[PDB]
Design a protein around this ligand. Structure first.
Ligand code: LOP
Ligand code: LOP
Ligand code: ANP
Ligand code: ANP
Ligand code: MG
Ligand code: MG
Lengths: 585, 585
């Protein structure tokens, strides 16, 4: 309820502040007319109360002008209220777009660890419920809480000024009792809403976790156990929502009992004032009409807005998504990369763990030199994608430096660092789009001749010549509508279309046959000139990197050896010699 | 608006029908009291209108009983309305649970092609918006549309009976004008709501597609292009929502102008009836009070329920998810599998394409015999996971048979078929849970000694002995918090814990080193007895299946050859000989 006010009453941009003030003026004029209309009703009743002695005479125009003033006052109240709702809905819709676009870019700016420590369907559900919560809070605050509070203020002022201080005592007493009762029963009521919110979040989490892994559910026949794990949280949500609605019905019944006792005591005191002759029947109909037209929107406010604290909770968690902490960022004076330099990465005394408990790269130190196709081998789980994500600066180590041409990568701009490093990862997800949009995702501003020659360069041409909708077939959710071989060839096509300088191939071939991997490695080695690209092959198939220029052996950090292939085979008892021997036998 | 009525007024289960009838009776009694209360106001006004000649006398109890009847009638109306809302909220919450649980199981019952041709975040968003739409439609239909229609009916009846037929003419004319104006401006208004719904769905789709592939966005620096593709649909949604709210403000202003003209003409005709002496001032305050307490909830109905056709659209698309067509199902008299038989699969004249355009298995015919570790090789894209999904009966072919022990698999129960077939797939997703819950997902009713010996059997023991929270480390979203090697060893641990009979290994080793794959294949070959499990290895690493019992060569369907390894190497120019030669060179 603070950053929303910062968005609807910002610093600068005086046009939206003028629109907010126009909405406030229309609100004030609408409530003034809605208080003026029972005075016209009192006038047309207390004027008609005289004794008429002629059934054939028309009514005088002095009463017709008061009846027309009643009608014009009622319609003017409704018209001004709806114009206020129109202009503040324009302001609210602009605030909703700017908060959605300002939270999406900051959701994109965060590091990889925060995204892997969350759930993307949960993020999308939180963003959607926060947007609908912002809409519901602004709609409730421009229609229900603010106008009825202003109406209570002006009706209490009218009843203080017009009919002495006993009505002031009655109105102050019933506002005091109303506030005490509402505060006590809301402090009782919030626990069931907390339980309902927790049960609904657990239900959505189990439904999403069972719908993403549909193949891993139907492989092991766990439909019934997942349905029961869903059903338990559904029963908890049903019990908590039933108790929420029953306690809110008790809230509304007690509140409107207090207000009905107030209205009946006000009409009774007005009647015994009429007995004394100080008042008239116009005061009776004025007092009832004022308190009744105050009592009806209080009932509808308490009824139809049963979820407003939940909307504040959703708005607050959307702003908490907005107000998180990005921890990977460029320095104060960021340097820029040179123009024609093959880059040689150098790790000195690096040490990094994804959590502070374990340390993956226990004092690793090596160098990837420029222009040489180097190759990283190692046992499964020895941190090779770790040093990939450390060059790419997704994370940052605890000690050591990640130097490029002597300068650190902490002092480089992160976009100018990530624009020269092309990479295929181990597990490749795709977009729910065609093959053409997925290949063209490398360079957006790329001509289609380059896209065609890259697709025919990445050994994907017979697949497009065999498909009936080539460069148009939708690959479905996450690339699951094609196999693993076409997915890895598509990722290699993306990196070949980007045409970067470093080219980290992180398991470039895992699900391709021997002929396709040999033709693909031949047409990648035949692509670029000597000493231009600093190609880094993270590979387990040791035959594919037998012709490499420098091989680096990893075993849970602490690089054991590095050198050419013949020297590593002619070494007395290395790890690469044993891996090559079990490969050849 | 039909299946919702089928859920709130079902066949059988008479307790919820008694609860619905109790809600309807409380609604009728609440509206009867709300029509009775201005008659008590007319009584206490027309009784107080006499000439009082004493300021010191107390008011008579004959007026105090009418004032107490006014207060009791108002509070009884509010109390009966809130009790009705309570019991129908109980019915609505039970209907919401049973529709969520009845749509989740049918979302699980569908085939794989429907799930791959959709988006899981879209399914979760549709389920959540359909649930909130069911809640909003039932809350609106028990509080706004039905009670105000019943109130309009009884107030029109009162004004027909009590004050002649001229008020009947006025009320019928203003209902006719109200209906004509509402129908015409709603037929104008629905287009902007359609555009807003399309823009919101496209915005949510682009946000989810960019948040799932966060690594593939940050690899290629496409933050700004995705932000602009988000921003365009956000601007379309903002324009359409602004036009929706402005047209709804025009709707409410015109409707309440018609009703204000009706109320002013009714008060004018009542006044000129009072001039004739037939009526009194009690009729004036009765007519205004009745039409005013009808006019206020019509205004709040038109205002606060600005999204009800959207709630019907979300409810009908949730029911459309419920009323889809499952096309993979067991027969009328499903057989069951025998008790101790090693199963031998036999494909005869099979032909299957995922779409009717292309045909993957162009007349394939082979046999996987029982007790033999067979091995499928082939070029990348030749349909190996296709015949995996055809044995598992995710899909069904166009011709040919998929026989097991002579009998077809169309006449077997699908759960008794899927309970003997264990399988690891190519791309393995995991649950957002620990390693213990992910290994235990194979057999839920498995003792923990079996889980420990399977984890130490699937070569995962040094990872658990190196982790600081072994069997407790959360693997994050979709298993991305561990590497590919631990993911494939986890899937092999799942299949080893299920202890099935067939064991389709679909690229069991793609991201493991040579030592780990050799130890894993040795401890899998040392597990089961001879001639018990009909192990089927879909493999590209031809060294891992050199000791297989029967190798089958695929190339875009139409199985080329099948036989042992030595006979396939000693063949004049086969495909497997060329793959083995490029493997050895
Ligand atoms: C969130 C809180 C924001 C601030 C809260 C507001 C606090 C002020 C609350 C009440 C002030 C009203 C004081 C009542 C005295 C009005 C005198 C009065 O009775 O005038 C009424 C119309 O009243 C009327 O039309 C109503 C008067 C409306 C003017 C006050 C509205 C505030 C303007 C800013 C006409 O009846 P009469 O007695 O015959 O007129 C006497 C001469 N005008
Ligand atoms: C979705 C549509 C569902 C059906 C639509 C309803 C259709 C029926 C609509 C109107 C019927 C009302 C007919 C009005 C005649 C009532 C006579 C009357 O004026 O009684 C009022 C109270 O009325 C009252 O208290 C109001 C009478 C309420 C009784 C009718 C409610 C329906 C019961 C079922 C008391 O005033 P009096 O004239 O002094 O009483 C005369 C003797 N009782
Ligand atoms: N976000 C993460 N949080 C915790 N551990 C992680 C995370 N990412 C990777 N790891 C762990 O860190 C260890 C090695 O990291 P990793 O760099 O992924 O090895 P790897 O080279 O990819 N293994 P492989 O794919 O078989 O070659 C393993 O225990 C991983 O599970
Ligand atoms: N739902 C699908 N819709 C359309 N095509 C599909 C679908 N699933 C798989 N395919 C295509 O069908 C062809 C081969 O299917 P597939 O069985 O996945 O081959 P594969 O053996 O897995 N290839 P590989 O992983 O390299 O061994 C390929 O063109 C796939 O893209
Ligand atoms: Mg790795
Ligand atoms: Mg395959």
């Amino acid at each position: 309820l603070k950053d929303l006010f910062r968005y609807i009453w910002p610093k600068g941009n005086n046009k939206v502040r003028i629109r907010v003030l126009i909405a406030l003026g229309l609100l004030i004029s609408a409530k003034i007319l809605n208080v003026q209309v029972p005075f016209f009703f009192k006038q047309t009743i207390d004027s008609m109360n005289i004794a008429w002695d002629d059934p054939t005479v028309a009514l005088p125009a002095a009463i017709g002008l008061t009846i027309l003033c009643y009608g014009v006052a009622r319609f003017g109240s409704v018209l001004f209220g709806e114009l206020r709702n129109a202009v503040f809905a324009k302001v609210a819709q602009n605030a909703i777009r700017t908060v959605s676009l300002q939270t999406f870019q900051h959701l994109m700016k965060l590091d990889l660890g925060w995204h892997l420590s969350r759930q993307t369907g949960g993020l999308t559900r939180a963003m959607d419920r926060g947007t609908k919560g912002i809409s519901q809070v602004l709609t409730a605050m421009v229609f229900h809480i603010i106008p009825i509070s202003f109406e209570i203020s002006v009706v209490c002022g009218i009843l203080t000024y017009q009919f002495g201080a006993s009505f002031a005592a009655i109105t102050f007493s019933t506002m005091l009792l109303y506030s005490i009762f509402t505060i006590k029963t809301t402090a009782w009521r919030t626990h069931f809403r907390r339980d309902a919110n927790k049960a609904d979040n657990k239900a959505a989490s189990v439904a999403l976790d069972s719908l993403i892994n549909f193949e891993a559910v139907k492989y092991f026949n766990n439909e019934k156990y997942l349905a029961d794990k869903y059903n338990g949280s559904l029963m908890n949500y049903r019990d908590s929502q039933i108790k929420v609605s029953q306690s809110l019905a008790f809230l509304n019944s007690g509140q409107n009992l207090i207000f009905t006792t107030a209205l009946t005591a006000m009409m009774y005191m007005g009647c015994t004032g009429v007995i004394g002759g100080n008042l008239t029947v116009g005061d009776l109909v004025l007092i009832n009409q004022l308190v009744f037209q105050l009592s009806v929107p209080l009932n509808f406010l308490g009824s139809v807005y049963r979820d407003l604290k939940q909307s504040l909770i959703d708005m607050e968690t959307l702003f908490k998504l907005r107000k998180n902490e990005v921890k990977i960022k460029n320095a104060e004076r960021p340097l820029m990369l040179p123009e024609n330099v093959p880059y040689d990465i150098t790790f000195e005394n690096v040490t990094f763990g994804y959590h502070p408990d374990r340390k993956i790269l226990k004092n690793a130190s090596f160098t990837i030199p420029a222009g040489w196709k180097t190759a990283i081998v190692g046992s499964s789980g020895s941190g090779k994608s770790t040093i990939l994500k450390l060059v790419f600066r997704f994370y940052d180590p605890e000690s050591g430096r990640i130097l490029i041409n002597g300068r650190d990568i902490k002092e480089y701009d992160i976009d100018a660092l990530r624009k020269v490093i092309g990479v295929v990862p181990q597990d490749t997800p795709l977009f729910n789009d065609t093959i053409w949009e997925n290949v063209k995702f490398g360079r957006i501003d790329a001509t289609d001749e380059e896209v065609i020659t890259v697709v025919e360069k990445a050994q994907l041409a017979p697949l497009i010549k065999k498909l009936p909708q080539g460069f148009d077939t939708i690959v479905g959710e996450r690339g699951l509508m094609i196999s693993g071989g076409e997915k890895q060839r598509l990722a290699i096509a993306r990196v070949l279309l980007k045409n970067a300088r470093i080219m980290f191939f992180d398991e470039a071939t895992s699900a391709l046959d021997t002929h396709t991997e040999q033709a693909l490695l031949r047409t990648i080695r035949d692509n670029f000139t000597s000493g231009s690209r600093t190609s880094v092959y993270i590979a387990h198939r040791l035959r594919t990197i037998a012709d490499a220029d420098k091989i680096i052996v990893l075993d849970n950090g602490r690089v054991r050896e590095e050198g050419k292939h013949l020297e590593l085979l002619a070494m007395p008892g290395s790890l690469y010699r044993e891996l090559w021997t079990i490969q050849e036998d």
